[PDB]
């Protein structure tokens, strides 16, 4: 173990800007046709969810609040992104994680969010759906769901490696990293390795690059079979070029630790 990897817990998107989120939510809701528009009482319940999360209240979100959150994230694609941001923030909370990601009903949740990861989608929706998936690994239910749904989610992640949206790429790299944390924890890794390598090949953002290298170091750590697979495959050859990268320093340093294992 070194200062980069192996990560033992999920890397999350924790920035909390509830005023901005709630502001935009109300503004965009106002542009909805009347049939789809959330009511004043619906908006109060979403505000309350944000209050509980942002104030770290011991009061748990209600069934009624989580039902409204579900309704909110099912609104027209042009205006869903603030409600997705409430979800991204809320999904780390045990009550919310369990009621969206549990065994029986989680497939409905993930399939909905995966629909928002379509390459022609609104980039804000793609970004927030990815960040939400990153965040749901903090809970046991979220972790189970991400593993059972991994074929679908990894397929969709890979398709977003295109272009140059740095924030989406960072979220992709973080999704790979959170998967690596799960495989590190237990004993699959070959699939996770193709994911990391495929994205790493194309991404330009150095934060995304860094998180992919952390994902790779985490994936092979403390598993002699995984190190040997990586060595046999010649992973060292594909990441050698990062060993020369001078800024940020963390990229070359993380890469040199991986190269030390291989």
């Amino acid at each position: 173990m070194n200062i980069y990897f192996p990560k033992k817990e999920a890397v999350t998107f924790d920035q909390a800007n509830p005023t901005q989120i709630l502001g935009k939510l109300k503004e965009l809701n106002g542009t909805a046709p009347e049939e789809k528009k959330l009511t004043e009482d619906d908006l109060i319940l979403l505000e309350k969810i944000l209050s509980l999360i942002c104030n770290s209240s011991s009061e748990k979100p209600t069934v009624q609040q989580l039902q409204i959150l579900w309704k909110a994230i099912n609104c027209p694609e042009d205006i869903v992104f603030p409600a997705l941001d409430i979800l991204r923030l809320s999904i780390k909370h045990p009550s919310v994680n369990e009621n969206f990601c549990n065994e029986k009903e989680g497939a409905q949740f993930s399939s909905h969010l995966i629909n928002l990861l379509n390459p022609k989608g609104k980039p804000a929706n793609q970004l927030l759906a990815l960040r939400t998936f990153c965040n749901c690994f903090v809970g046991q239910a979220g972790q189970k769901l991400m593993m059972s749904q991994r074929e679908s989610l990894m397929s969709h992640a890979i398709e977003l490696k295109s272009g140059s949206n740095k924030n989406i790429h960072i979220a992709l790299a973080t999704l790979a990293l959170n998967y690596s944390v799960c495989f590190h924890k237990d004993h699959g890794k070959a699939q996770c390795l193709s994911l990391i390598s495929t994205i790493l090949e194309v991404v330009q953002d150095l934060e995304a690059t860094f998180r992919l290298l952390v994902a790779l170091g985490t994936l092979i750590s403390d598993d002699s079979n995984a190190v040997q697979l990586a060595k046999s495959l010649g992973v060292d050859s594909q990441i050698k070029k990062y060993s020369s990268v001078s800024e940020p320093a963390k990229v070359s340093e993380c890469c040199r630790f991986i190269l030390n294992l291989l």
């Binding site: 901005q20 989120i21 502001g23 935009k24």
Partner: peptide, 4 residues
Amino acid sequence: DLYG
């Protein structure tokens, strides 16, 4: 870049 979202907000807003």
